[PDB]
Design an enzyme around this catalytic site. Structure first.
Site, PDB file in Angstrom:
ATOM      1  N   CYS A  55       0.830  -1.223   0.000  1.00 26.01           N
ATOM      2  CA  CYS A  55       0.000   0.000   0.000  1.00 26.01           C
ATOM      3  C   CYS A  55       0.851   1.254   0.000  1.00 26.01           C
ATOM      4  O   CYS A  55       0.690   2.186  -0.804  1.00 26.01           O
ATOM      5  CB  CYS A  55      -1.014  -0.024   1.159  1.00 26.01           C
ATOM      6  SG  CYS A  55      -0.318  -0.036   2.782  1.00 26.01           S
ATOM      7  N   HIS A  69      -3.481   0.987   6.455  1.00 22.34           N
ATOM      8  CA  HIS A  69      -3.595   1.044   5.015  1.00 22.34           C
ATOM      9  C   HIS A  69      -3.562   2.507   4.563  1.00 22.34           C
ATOM     10  O   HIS A  69      -3.899   3.413   5.325  1.00 22.34           O
ATOM     11  CB  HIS A  69      -4.881   0.347   4.568  1.00 22.34           C
ATOM     12  CG  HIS A  69      -5.003   0.145   3.081  1.00 22.34           C
ATOM     13  ND1 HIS A  69      -4.011  -0.432   2.322  1.00 22.34           N
ATOM     14  CD2 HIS A  69      -6.022   0.396   2.222  1.00 22.34           C
ATOM     15  CE1 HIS A  69      -4.407  -0.514   1.064  1.00 22.34           C
ATOM     16  NE2 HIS A  69      -5.630  -0.037   0.975  1.00 22.34           N
ATOM     17  N   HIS A 127      -5.299   2.421  -4.753  1.00 26.56           N
ATOM     18  CA  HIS A 127      -4.521   1.727  -3.724  1.00 26.56           C
ATOM     19  C   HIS A 127      -4.077   0.345  -4.202  1.00 26.56           C
ATOM     20  O   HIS A 127      -4.598  -0.163  -5.188  1.00 26.56           O
ATOM     21  CB  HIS A 127      -5.299   1.656  -2.410  1.00 26.56           C
ATOM     22  CG  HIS A 127      -6.604   0.908  -2.472  1.00 26.56           C
ATOM     23  ND1 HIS A 127      -7.020   0.053  -1.468  1.00 26.56           N
ATOM     24  CD2 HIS A 127      -7.593   0.896  -3.401  1.00 26.56           C
ATOM     25  CE1 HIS A 127      -8.202  -0.441  -1.775  1.00 26.56           C
ATOM     26  NE2 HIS A 127      -8.587   0.075  -2.929  1.00 26.56           N
TER      27      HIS A 127
END
Ligand SMILES: [Cl-]
Ligand SMILES: [Cl-]
Lengths: 305, 297
Positions: B174, B234, B246
């Site tokens: 991420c 995240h 993402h």
């Protein structure tokens, strides 16, 4: 959850990203153990938040929920029966339009296989296991039937493919053109020639014909595998630590740091003293593809049929 | 002995400890300068983002400070396409020397045909097609560092696999997606999401998302309690209209609007805040460009 075994509607799957990363347990903080490729059929063994899967080499490991498409046997069979477009170049992209300047759908690597849907200009129209549609350049791919028809599986053709990977990085558990480990280099090269053998060096070491290497190396031949490690003693069995592809004349190509060529001749500039002193034996395997369990081509492998 | 080095493979794999059976923690790129902290069979290194980890001895070229400085002063060829190879001859049908990925930088030695002649830190010589690379001076003279261009680069990675600790065009995590994209625009920020969350300006997201702008990072995780600090799990890059790009399974685009077909409920429910970071490059320790970063100077 903890689902084991899988229900029939989710007992099978297909990898739907270029390269997926199998780990020892269902978590990122577990070591990578192998990798599988876009379009590759797998068995789905259980689910706990991640899937435990089995690849066509019988190897098992865990992948994140989002990287395979689980399905019924019926749907898996439909996927496998469709003629594929086979990616033949190491690297590229599939695109939204028949134009390499258009929005990409994903990267692809050699060995990736997508369902052939049509053709437009210098592109094949393709679909992914998850239903995505895309275009692949005819310059990096070709239809599966014709690919098989022209496929060479002789030692020289195989070695040429290995040479095409010169300098690619070593990656532990790596099993694609992106990066390879010692045994993964072997597998990545072989898969580009439609061949599957066992995944781990310790299993590759016991396939085909065992060659006890003569002091003069006269009985080891180009295309054999050479293995390195810890010799057996009375108190301890042998340990296989490394493998390369033998090139003749005491040379071998292997993945260690990167894909490179080394020598077992102390007079050569590329002498690899460390592995040479740990040389165990060679294996001649190419003659036995589809002749012993564990070594096969995808047209014969039961995961594909 | 050696305190400096340069990565000499396309992408090297830093691990938590000096062994293959330890987790990957980040990755570094061909031609990137590193500090060499110790050796135990593997090298412990520090990358220009100040992150540390371990690499196999064979993957970097250790150097004296003087040689390191010479490497850094040499004008580079910068790889601008995601993937390709460098070759033994100025011909893509000749024997390859190695793969290359975007962000790789090699020493510029000349030109033949439509190829730059280049050299590696270890001394290899090769040719890179002008179609996948650009000289550093011209790269800098054409550099794009605006939000829109950064988003275009993220979109150019659509569908690339998620890879834990992945920090190149090959595969990204991420925070690694953020870093991979940014390095193609000459920008370095902290490696881990837990550090990225505290750079720049903190954006307390309004219910209409009206104070969140394209190019902000969006962070997801576990909210702070009376007893426990927040946990950052995240990160994505905000695209406007409640969408974000993402890396999770692969690089894809999700929505925080429940009405949208690409609504991501799990992450939306864990939304914490956004961060506006781009205005603050070269204005905080650990966010910089390679023309200012001390590893390169
Ligand atoms: Cl590695
Ligand atoms: Cl992963």
């Amino acid at each position: 959850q903890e689902i084991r075994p899988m229900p029939a509607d989710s007992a099978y799957g297909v990898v739907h990203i270029s390269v997926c990363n199998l780990r020892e347990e269902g978590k990122f903080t577990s070591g990578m153990s192998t990798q599988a490729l876009l379009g590759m059929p797998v068995k789905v063994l259980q689910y706990n938040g991640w899937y435990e899967i089995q690849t066509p080499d019988d190897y098992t490991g865990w992948v994140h929920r989002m990287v395979i498409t689980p399905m019924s046997k019926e749907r898996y069979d439909e996927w496998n029966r469709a003629e594929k477009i086979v990616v033949t170049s190491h690297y590229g992209f599939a695109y939204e339009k028949p134009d390499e300047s258009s929005q990409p759908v994903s990267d692809v690597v050699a060995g990736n296989r997508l369902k052939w849907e049509g053709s437009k200009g210098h592109f094949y129209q393709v679909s992914y296991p998850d239903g995505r549609k895309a275009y692949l350049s005819k310059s990096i791919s070709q239809p599966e039937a014709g690919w098989r028809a022209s496929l060479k599986q002789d030692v020289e053709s195989i070695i040429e493919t290995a040479y095409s990977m010169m300098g690619i990085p070593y990656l532990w558990a790596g099993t694609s053109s992106k990066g390879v480990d010692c045994s993964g280099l072997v597998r990545t090269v072989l898969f580009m020639h439609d061949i599957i053998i066992p995944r781990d060096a310790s299993q590759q070491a016991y396939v085909g014909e065992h060659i006890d290497i003569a002091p003069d190396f006269s009985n080891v031949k180009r295309g054999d595998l050479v293995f390195f490690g810890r010799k057996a003693t009375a108190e301890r069995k042998e340990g296989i630590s490394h493998v390369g592809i033998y090139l003749g004349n005491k040379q071998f190509i292997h993945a260690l740091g990167d894909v490179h060529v080394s020598s077992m001749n102390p007079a050569d500039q590329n002498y690899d003293e460390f592995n040479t002193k740990r040389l165990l034996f060679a294996v001649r395997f190419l003659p036995y593809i589809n002749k012993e369990k564990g070594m096969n081509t995808t047209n014969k492998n039961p995961f594909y049929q």
